[model samples]
Target: DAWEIPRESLRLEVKLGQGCFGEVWMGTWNGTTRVAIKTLKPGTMSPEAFLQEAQVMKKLRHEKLVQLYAVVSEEPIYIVTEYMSKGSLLDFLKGEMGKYLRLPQLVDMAAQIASGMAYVERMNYVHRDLRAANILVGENLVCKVADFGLARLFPIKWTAPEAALYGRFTIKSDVWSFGILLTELTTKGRVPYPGMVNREVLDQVERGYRMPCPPECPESLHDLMCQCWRKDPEERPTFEYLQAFLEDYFTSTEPQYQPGENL
Candidate 1:
């Protein structure tokens, strides 16, 4: 009779969140700190990819990277990560109030994110998915990179013809994603394609069209974004260089805007 029951038991109280993956649950671990668990869709991802993610995460130790608390099950794999009370940067940006951030505040957050990406890049890894949805921001606007399931080792060739044509994942692609995130931050979290389908998004991007910058965005910030979204991935700056550039920019500029009252 015991064998008929589940092999493992967890007293997890779950709450769902947005996105097209399986249900996300907010729960606790060992009756202690709260955690977030994402249950993967069976047959949607290969076991290899899941295992690779777990292995990579286990090896990464950084303040800006989410910590993997535990693995619930390998059969129907469930991953647990430290619960970010403040939720994601995307959510934070889209709060009811408009003009949630000033330009300086946005640059500061972007710099922090770039620092995290730089650390990952220094380790020769690539966070294939680097977007606002994958960034969690907490008090003081501290940010940590999340969602490593789609991450991979950095590719050797930055702009191989095959990779470019097939839209292969790479560090440069991460830069492109980061540029999109910069745009998102500037726009207070507007989706890249509010009413557009996947095909439309892809077609527009391929045709050299990108999300428009906000009217109030600065020229310097706009230049950085343009560099990130260059049609040629090879032209994209390295995370190390981007981090330095942002750090310098933030250092030289005084805070021109404050966190909006809503934020």
Candidate 2:
């Protein structure tokens, strides 16, 4: 026989979302604020890295980065963050409103994204998975970089072979991922290879073939994406330069949309 637990015992109701190395739950806390909770699997990877990410996020106070509220360690390690109701940019781009984005809107979105990435870069941290799926856009159009699980501290030039095998991420590698994300945004979530495998995409990129940027995409944006996806990582522009270029582009274009009201 089990004892009936009171409602007060539960802080929030956990609704499951996508889970990879850990589980993500959408829930409410403090009887008011909504939040997302991530619980990592034990022995999945280096717990030290996970703790480092939490520490970094706890210290960061940027509008573009997700806010870390608390860490619970009763059983599974739980990390709480602000709930992004609208979900990832990838889902939004694939949704109905995706095709309606005009040139100006697209440019504004790109600029906002670059600004967020630039903020993180300024802190000397690398977001290894800067993809559409990792970027969250709120109802107010506030863009935030999420999922810092794969992010690594920069300036560590040397990496172990195993790390490389698991895609040991760097600032340069994040730039490459950002280029892919830009392509996805420009094409409204269209993947690089419609029918090709992962190996083919990697081969094409390694062979100096830039990811496909649709003809409808602005020429300036095309150039930026090209530089980001360059075969040599060293050729990619720094986040500072990218942000400046995006700001200039937005200024010249007179974008209709603007950064979120608060941000």
Candidate 3:
């Protein structure tokens, strides 16, 4: 409830990107700090919906999750938060694909993402859209989850099977999306199920088809991915389980994860 700042405090300087809500702008906070500003498009995204999410957002304070610096519920609603130097995680990973990250870096990246989702799990909040593109990063590869637009508002290709079929969205469905995210990370921005229509993707997923792990993805990590992709939502592990699993990956023997090479 503490996230409040006058509209006059922010100055939009550049357009960042546009999405379902509206245009996301990069600007200064009180003319001193760099931040990202998201505004709902006129007549499209509801002020009531955005505001409702903001109120719940005010209660969420987690390092792994992107900070909701403030919201100006005035003439035009604009949400302000820290600016991630890098763009979308998938976009950033595209540049690093050829020979960028090693297996260990991928492990850490997946772990950080799970850590963010785990916090949301504890708060009883479900990130309806949890995908590689929704995750952002800073230098030193610090991963922070972003784009908490709406829960059950819509489901993307990364959406869970139950979410697509039955509109079921619980913490476990989020685990399904987590499996997809892991695929994106290890494959270094490869599009999942290329040339397959959403319906085809849906049918295949419903039939228990999971993305093949990248060559460099370890057997243990691949096994974890399969666990996440289980058709029965109840069968999927929670973020807490994935968090501990990933933590163990880091602590065991500590093999150096050479990027672009198999472990």
Candidate 4:
């Protein structure tokens, strides 16, 4: 359950971000509490639909999933959440910050993401947009999955082959996006499929094209990416499976290996 924070408590200070649905404001609550306030644009998405989505967000709680603190359903609709000062995972990986990330840091972040997705997977839900941009990092670099799958829509480049073709998303489809997210992390946020537009990306993906391994990407992890890339959605590993596998990979023998190096 969620409690309402008075609208006056949220003093929108600056615009932090804008999304397909609305704009996010960085603000203070009750003059002290830091929070991110999402104000929905009128007449963009049906209020009934967005409200239902907000309810779902409020009910969901996990260490690695963003928290929806309060939502105002009436006119001037807004969704209040914990403020993530570091912003999206994508931004964190692009600049000087990426240079300091070590092997353990990358693995731990991936595992945390998988851990979050495992919970979502158990709930029998699909996160239509599962990409670096939708993942947030809070204070102390705690990574979380933000925004859920109430809308069956996604960014084309991060989308799986099936979803891109048919405009539908499943748990497996999310696995594919998670694979690409790994690429984003390992490549330090290099443009996905550099030089290719969405239409070109869609065509290449449908024809079995895949991005090459990120520099210094562990073999075991790259294998996971390829497994997720399998043309048949049924061949993709579930988030639960990935959560378990990454756990072992981080502690198991031969933690470092490449494609043909494995016996």
Candidate 5:
């Protein structure tokens, strides 16, 4: 059975960030286990949608996906999840830590996200929003996809052409988004199509203008991204295929020489 956290036992500390619904926080559960908490704002969504979020989260259990610890299913819904200390992949890439990550580590991060999404695909789920911002990073640099079963909402730049055009979303749409996410990782979190507005990005994409490869990205990986943006969603690679390819790619590459942090 899914655990129902008593509202009184949860205590919130520093604000983590603002979510679409309400503020998120670094919180403690029963003054013991540290957890990430997401609260829902009043009248922001239907009660049905609120409950649906909890229901869907309960079913998705994977090491590469953020685990839902419990929920306070009442007014101002509070969602308790595993605390990912390193925070979102988006911020991690754009912040000070971004410069220190070698290409191999970046590739590993992509591989980790793919492994998680592959599991989501296995469960026949579509992550309507699959971008760097939705992926959380843990202390050991593990990446996990979060905020699933959400995002009936859409973001034009990160969205697939079909989903942007006709509101159609499938795993293929997610694959397209993953390609954009790859750019985020490779470019150290540059926004897709810099200086372009949503309408401009949509027009360019509709007319077949995909973003060029990042400066230091491998040609093979860039080619993979192009395949993901194929006009026909059916032609895009599956998450499982991507996971396997990235895993093999990372394993076969030699690590860059660097100084060790010795005592």
Candidate 6:
């Protein structure tokens, strides 16, 4: 298929991030196109599993979802996606630029993410790896969902109770993860349940303890997060609904100064 790329045409540049099971790199394709290349650490898994990602990724196309361009399915498999200049939303929110972002801008970021998620939900695809780390930011701080269909990955802190306890992954569980992401955005990337261990978080969440609002975060925003954390996953707002809410929130908070210029 056209998704296949000759490994020799790709040039791996700087190491981007070292993951528990893999490494991401800033790479170039055909000495021109910038890309993010993912390759598993040695002894991680066979090429079949790695190649499977391409099957799911290739079908998904959206401005708010990282685009999968090519794959090298040989030993030390390669998965190439569009390069996000600003990197993951997790690191981006903790960076200097993130600190300068206003609440409205942050809301815009959330809206953008939700827009992509809405599309994914409409397609009946559950983004099992939804999190700040899996959301990448590009120029102008545009955020996009990445690492789709990798349902094998999990981080207990961002996971919903139903998903964490019973391995249930639905659009609603993604809503729960989005709520945790709002906390990250509000705090400019503070870890959820700051001092608690994984077990403590799980136990507390099970016992009806939601994370307190971040300093300076609007009450309404936190309230929306609580809605996403409803006890029943079916009760959580859909990503489509969340996107519209955030879109209006951003509009209401923005200054009315509109110059006739489009960035």
Which candidate tops lDDT?
A: 5
Off by over 4 Å in 4: 19-21, 43-46, 148-154, 253-263
Clashes per prediction?
0, 0, 3, 0, 0, 0
Stretches off by above 4 angstroms in model 3 are: 96-98, 152-156, 253-263
- Candidate 6 per-residue lDDT, tens place, 96-205, comes to 77657778678889999999999898878888768898899999879999873573324998889998999888889899999999998888888889999998988899
Can you write out model 4's per-residue Cα lDDT over 1-263, one digit (the tens) per residue? 34655677779999998877778899888898888888878888668666776777755688888887777777678788888889889999886687787656766788889999988888777888888888898877789998733533137888898887886679889899899888887787777888999989988988889988676776667888999888898999989888877767756834554332111
Model 6 weakest lDDT span, ten residues long: 254-263
Give me the displacement of residue 62 in model 6, in angstroms.
1.1
* Top candidate by TM-score: 5
lDDT of residue 130 for candidate 3: 87
* Ranking of all candidate structures by their TM-score, best first: 5, 6, 3, 4, 2, 1
Clashing pairs in 1: none
Error of 1 at 69 (Å): 2.0
The lDDT of each candidate is 0.71, 0.67, 0.80, 0.80, 0.85, 0.84
Candidate 1: tens digits of C-alpha lDDT, residues 205-252: 677765565667766777788798887778989988888888777556
lDDT of 2 by residue, 1-263 (tens): 02112333336466657556677788766667787777678777446566655766765678777787667643355677888878888888889768676666666677778888887788777776677877888776677898766555621112211223455556777776677777777777776556766565555545555545575666667788778866556778988887777767866543443444211
Worst lDDT window (10 residues) for model 2?
Answer: 154-163
Per-model root-mean-square deviation over C-alphas? 5.7, 7.1, 2.5, 3.9, 3.5, 4.2
Looking at candidate 3, the ten consecutive residues that score lowest on lDDT are 253-262
Candidate scoring better on TM-score of 2 and 6: 6
TM-scores for candidates 1 onward, in order = 0.77, 0.79, 0.89, 0.87, 0.91, 0.90
List the pairs of residues colliding in candidate 6: none
Q: What TM-score does candidate 6 get on C-alpha atoms? A: 0.90
Encode model 5's per-residue lDDT on 1-263: one tens digit a residue.
45787888899999988867677899899999999988778787656576677788778899999998998887778889899999999999989998888667887898999999999888888888999999999987999998746733248888998988898899999999999999999888989899999989988999999999777676778898999999999999999999988888754543343322210
Better of 1 and 3 by TM-score: 3
After the best TM-score superposition of candidate 6, give how far the Cα of residue 149 lies from its true spot, in angstroms: 4.6
